[PDB]
Symmetry: C7
Subunit: 253 residues, 7 copies
């Protein structure tokens, strides 16, 4: 009867506490810290609260005066719990879908908002990213709405260099072409590049400068080394050819 059902609740409560002891062993893993005492206390309190609620519900059902006040209170508490748990299920679903489309793997370079780093590990609710300063960022999946991946597909560079307006375009463009040529005859750099450079010439005009563009396409994650080498060669050849940097201009009175 009611007493037999009440004993079943107590038996299940002990099993949940025994399951909490199993969770203590799981929590006992060195990876998730060693201060699991607080977490265990919360689980025990929750189990006790659930057992007390079940017992009170049984008593009220056997009372005959309707559980309406207490039932309404429990319903309000459950509604609050459901309202507060939107974000968690949001992270779970978002992460499940992200791994479904092979959006993120471990070790690749990504960009989530204002952060760029390498993925270290993915939990059920968040993803760990290691920044170039050594900081470890924990980003929940629902916080992620748009991200970029640098290992998928191919890589490319687009380089723009500003040249002073007073000079002529033919000499500066030839200097840039020569700088790219010296880069091409280098062996491992040319191994990184895939194909031939794309010279665009003047791509803009300013009040004191004009800009020249040259674009490549390289191996994934190799664009930055090529960019740095190109910058060094461009500086060297601009110095050789006498190309001037943009200079401010003014008049007096």
């Amino acid at each position: 009867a009611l007493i037999l059902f009440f004993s079943a609740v107590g038996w299940t409560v002990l099993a949940s506490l025994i399951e909490n002891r199993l969770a203590s062993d799981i929590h006992g893993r060195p990876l998730p810290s060693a201060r699991t005492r607080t977490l265990l206390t919360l689980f025990r309190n929750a189990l006790a609260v659930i057992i007390s609620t079940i017992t009170i519900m049984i008593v009220l059902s056997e009372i005959g005066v309707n559980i309406a006040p207490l039932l309404a209170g429990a319903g309000a508490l459950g509604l609050a719990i459901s309202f507060g748990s939107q974000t968690l299920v949001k992270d779970i679903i978002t992460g499940v879908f992200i791994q479904f489309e092979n959006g993120m793997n471990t070790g690749d370079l990504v960009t989530i908002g204002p952060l760029t780093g390498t993925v270290e590990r993915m939990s059920i609710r968040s993803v760990g990213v290691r920044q170039d300063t050594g900081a470890y960022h924990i980003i929940p999946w629902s916080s992620i709405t748009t991200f970029a991946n640098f290992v998928r597909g191919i890589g490319s560079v687009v380089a723009n260099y500003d040249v002073d307006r007073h000079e002529d375009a033919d000499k500066a463009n030839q200097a840039l072409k020569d700088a790219v040529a010296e880069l091409m005859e280098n062996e491992e750099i040319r191994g990184l590049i895939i194909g031939e450079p794309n010279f665009a010439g003047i791509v803009g005009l300013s009040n004191t400068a004009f800009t020249l563009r040259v674009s490549f396409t390289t191996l994934p994650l190799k664009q930055w080394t090529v960019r740095f080498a190109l910058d060094s060669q461009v500086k060297k050849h601009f110095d050789l050819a006498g190309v001037r940097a943009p200079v401010q201009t003014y008049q007096v009175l």
Copy 2:
């Protein structure tokens, strides 16, 4: 009876696990990575949880003490699940409607917020865009609200060039007209352009400069090459005609 219904639940649970094995084969595709072990474990856990919930519901219905506590808990969990799944159905509906109006195809150049690139593939929940730096962006449909497409219809250029205030408009405007004339007699460039240039003359006055505007209408995705050629010719002809760039001015004491 209850036992026969319980056996049916177990039979369906095995079928779902067999369906999960079929999903494992689907997940086994090289495109969606190779670490599908985690996804399979989640599906198995979900199937086990569903089977346990069904069995407990049957037992409680056959108990006679009302499923009210457990039923309310299940209802709260379902409410949380429904609340957390708003974004997913939002992406699904938004993508379905976007493909309905032929808003986006594969390979075209688009602009979604601060990102400009070529569409590579569209999933049920997101769209992949390839940037000019080689990064691969995953953008969910609900995150997309307003976007532009450069392949629909036509293309056009509007070019504004700043000339300092001290010179006269007739000489600078004539120099710009001559620069456009040299561009027109070029053959492939004229093939890109559709029609005749639209000279607007002075379109603004600054404290140290005035601006001249000339606009074209070209083939789709061909506006940038025409713009670069026009910039080069404008610089050359401005140098030829002696037109000066804007210069700062000050007085002493």
Copy 3:
């Protein structure tokens, strides 16, 4: 009985698939692309899911063990669908109301947020706008909260020109008046203008300049040509009268 009702469900399912084939013909229109295969598959899957849900509901109703678990799951799914469809009905209602008040027509120049262009077509959920760069923007109605229309009513110009503080106001104001006078005696420009210019004189003082204002009222969409002509004439007459542009000033030690 139940079997007769089940046969009716199957008959309706085939009719929906036949209706999907009718939608395939509608989707077959060249305007909405040619890759309608994906859309048809989704419709077929939805019809199959609906038929299966109806059959399972009938079986459960004829079972006698209550549909409560499955009914609650279906209710949660429907709640999620309703929650995710807020935006779509929002666009539908907003567009219906916008067309009710004659807010937007096709071909007129509008400004929706940071975008200015001519309306090309309006769907049930969005509106297409053509920018001056040739890009085609798709803007849903709910994303629209405030917009401006340049074809309703009239057009006007308010022109402010900065003159440096050192000169006198009477000479510069007279030069501006003469510049407007030359503009007035032109024939087509005066045809664009409706009425007489409104001279306001000095309307502000800066540390190194003062500003003069003149305003007109012209035909719709004709304000920019008048503004450009006024700017050219103002520059010419300021050069003629010897009016100086604002100049920076400093002192040494």
Copy 4:
């Protein structure tokens, strides 16, 4: 019986279509455009959908297999409709309350966010504002959260003028006082002003300037003309008295 009720539904459907024809005449007004064909088609489709839903509901009620699937679908659709209609009733209530407190009339100058213009007309959902560039802005009431009105009450000006630090305050303040004095003896300007000027003297110190403040109180919508006249007189009297504008200062080495 059921057939008699079904005939009543058909009779009401025709009346709604006849009411749509009456709405067509209302829509036929030249003010709300002439392309009301699309709106009429939507109304006809909605009436047909409502009639079909009513007929299906009657058939299902007379079937005996419960309307539960279809009733739940209709409930979900109604929930989505109610969720998507929050903004519309928000505009209706906000506008009703705004006209209740006499916040806005037709023809007055207002400022709603970043827009300043004269109210032209108010609908049930929006308000039309005419900008000084001739653009016509449609602003829904719910989008309005805070606005200012320039015709209610009185008007005032607060004028701050920057004077170089190196000069003395007594001479510059006397020059400003004389400039206000000349303004006062003018007749229509003095008619605009209500009372006497309020001289505050130095109200701030900068690294290269100090500022003098004088404030008035004038008729509504007349503050700007008084401000412009005061600016012109202040410039003239500052030139007469030899008061210098703020000047940058530096030292070498």
Copy 5:
């Protein structure tokens, strides 16, 4: 019976229209404008709609075919009305609570976000604030989340003056002290101040300047006059003592 109840509905509808006529007299007050015709029409339409809904509900209840479609539609409409009325009850509650704590009175100087002005009147939903330019701002209570009041308690000034780095602190600090001394011996200003000045000396170092701080505590709303007088005296005494303003510095080559 049903007819007797229907007659009661009609009798109440006329009473509501008579109550609307009473509201017309209330609306007839000159303060809430004179165009109350539109408001009366809306009230009459609402009363007619309510009467029609009640009659249709009675007819449907006496029909026997369940009001379920129409009842569900009415429930959806009521849900939309409740959803759209969140802001109004929010303003009502916020204003009621604000007047409970004596946060705002009429005539005092407040600062609500980017607006500073004097409270003119408070409605049930908003508050009117008069700006120093004469504009009248209507701010709903829910839009208010944080505001400041200048009449509660006391007033104070904190004055920071920048002196160039090259000079010595003792001379400049003594000059500031003397400037405060001249202010103190003035009688009405000293009546405004409550106590003695608080000299803090150097409170910061810049690349080309250092700043000195002096703070007071005065009567409410009297801080600005004291600040202006202090600024004037500080300028005068800095000129007397030969204290220099911050000056830019550079070097050549």
Copy 6:
């Protein structure tokens, strides 16, 4: 019966009005202003509305035609009231939790967003903060999401001083060390400091300067006086040692 219950409602209504008279005495306190007449009228109107609603509900229950229209209207009104009261209960809970953790006391210096001041009093819904300009800010608890407290624990200073690149680090660092030494031998300042200074040397390099860092740890709320004294001593010793401030540099042609 119904009449006896109706008399009970009237008796309770009078008691609520008598309770409102008790609230009038409470509102009669000089602290919560003296214009409590408006609040009392609102309470009386609410009591009358509640009594009328109860009477109408009783009449409808005794009518037999279902309260469904009026009951649904009351339910919608209650739903709107509950929706609009989210913020109030949010403030109540947030404040209760804030006082639970001893986050804020009265008189301490706090920083809530862009505001820094001393707490004056805490209500059930908001907290009053006194700014250094004398303004009194009212901040609801829900508006508070993150704040800092300067009285808990200790205080510290981190001082960075910029020295131009041209000079040598050893001389400037020695000058800073000597400046700190003179500060240390002062007696009350050394009483404020707790321990020894932490010299960090160069902590950054700019194009025209390098920065030196020295950090302390002092008593709570005493960091600013120590900072000002350190700034004065640093300026004095930099002047003594001939250390130069950062200076701009350029080249000609």
Copy 7:
């Protein structure tokens, strides 16, 4: 009967007040302040309100006129309470999940938004962080959405130094290499570093400068000391080698 149940409610109310007295002892702890009188009064008021609500509910259930008005009011109050408690359960769940993944411990350096500091203590709803200025920040868990931890894993430095464009890269790069060499031969600094420096050479070109990059990997929380030492050595060796800082350039007329 009803009286026996009413006595049980009174007995439980006293037990709750006795439990409040136990909470008073808990609140009596010196850590959570000493003004717990206000909190106790709120608990007593809540207990009294709950007891009164239970008694009124029992009386209404024994009345026979339905609790519908009062039950609906209680339901609306509970709905408001549930709506206002979303944030609290959000913090609880977020903190529980954060501690689960070992995201934060006590004493480590973290970065939560614009705040960087050391964790001092974690409550159930918030986390205390000590800033370098001595301020104590209280941050709820729901307010936390993304944070970084500096003690997990390893630490690294990336140093960029700008060199004037006019000089040559080989000399400046050699000077930087020598500066790193002197740093390496230092003993405790080399103990901090883990491995060898990574020289990247030129990594960017500006209009007046080029930048050189060198990166390390050091012990956790030791990156800043290494960075400061590297900056000092780089300045010293740049001075030794005659490397110039970036300099502005202009031309006259």
